Amino acid sequence: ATLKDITRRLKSIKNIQKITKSMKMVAAAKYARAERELKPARVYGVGLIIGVSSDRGLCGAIHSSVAKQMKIIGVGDKIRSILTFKEVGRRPPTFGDASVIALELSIIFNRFRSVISYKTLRNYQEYSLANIIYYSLKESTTSEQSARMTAMDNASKNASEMIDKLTLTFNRTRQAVITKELIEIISGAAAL
């Protein structure tokens, strides 16, 4: 509406654009190392409700996807909050992470397809359990970082479009304000 409003809306959205862009690039880095790490883990994947995502949001429907399949153990803090293991996601998951979980004890996780897409004896049984937890975790992070990258790329491009639009609105208003003020002066002057 007013120049002051527009200026302040523009200030923040220009910030949001840069933040989401940096996030897109951090996620791109994690995903790149995650995909190259998923190859010698998928063939390894060949040999109760457990839910697998992460603590960190802003990765589209990664957390809500598995929670839909959900309704009890949750790996990823976003599972406990929407519906217990914390600090998963920020650092790439190890077999050590899979063992820590199995030691405390169907498994629901996101299977990576592409950047754009993802789909939701007593010593032998102990190993094949940890094997399942690991496979989910390695798939989980590839999907999540790909998704965060896409989400942030989308948010960044949206902000970018909003900036342009508000800038045009700004300049239309700016011109109107100058002209209006000028007409008041001339009308005041000519009436004398």
């Binding site: 949001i16 949001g57 802003l58 989400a151 989308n154 948010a155 902000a159």
Partner: protein, 156 residues
């Protein structure tokens, strides 16, 4: 602008058309939150008519307030409760559209005229969550609610 601004006080019912709405393909392009009537009153139109109307406007208003977030971050960052008001609001926005006899060349649909009680019923049913399983597009450019169901079935 002085001319339209001054005109509002001379009217009993205002139908305010919006370019943004027209450009989304919603015709007649009526702003459902900027159009008002002096007889929108439970003692005149009945409580049922009055309540459905206010309930439609509430969800549309609630949807509108969610649109800055949606613009930047999209659907996936909304709570499940918010996604529901969004999906229903979008179905309502579409069910307010209508093929006009006078506009058949532009719509490609046969003109439709809906009796008041059917209009109330249709929006009452959407608000009650009765068609949450149906896709948005089924509600676009139809007449009575039954046509929305048939359109959803034809979309199969």
């Amino acid at each position: 602008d002085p001319a339209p601004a001054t005109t509002f006080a001379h009217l009993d019912a205002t139908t305010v058309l919006s370019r943004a709405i027209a450009e989304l393909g919603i015709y007649p392009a009526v702003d459902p939150l900027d159009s008002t009537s002096r007889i929108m009153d439970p003692n005149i139109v009945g409580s049922e008519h009055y309540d459905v109307a206010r309930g439609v406007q509430k969800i549309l208003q609630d949807y509108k307030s969610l649109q800055d977030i949606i613009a930047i971050l999209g659907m996936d960052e909304l709570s499940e409760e918010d996604k529901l008001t969004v999906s229903r609001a979008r179905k309502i926005q579409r069910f307010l559209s209508q093929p006009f006899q006078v506009a058949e060349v532009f719509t490609g649909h046969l003109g439709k005229l809906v009796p008041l009680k059917e209009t109330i019923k249709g929006f009452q049913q959407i608000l009650a969550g009765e068609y949450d399983h149906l896709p948005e597009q089924a509600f676009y450019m139809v007449g009575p609610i039954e046509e929305a169901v048939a359109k959803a079935d034809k979309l199969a």
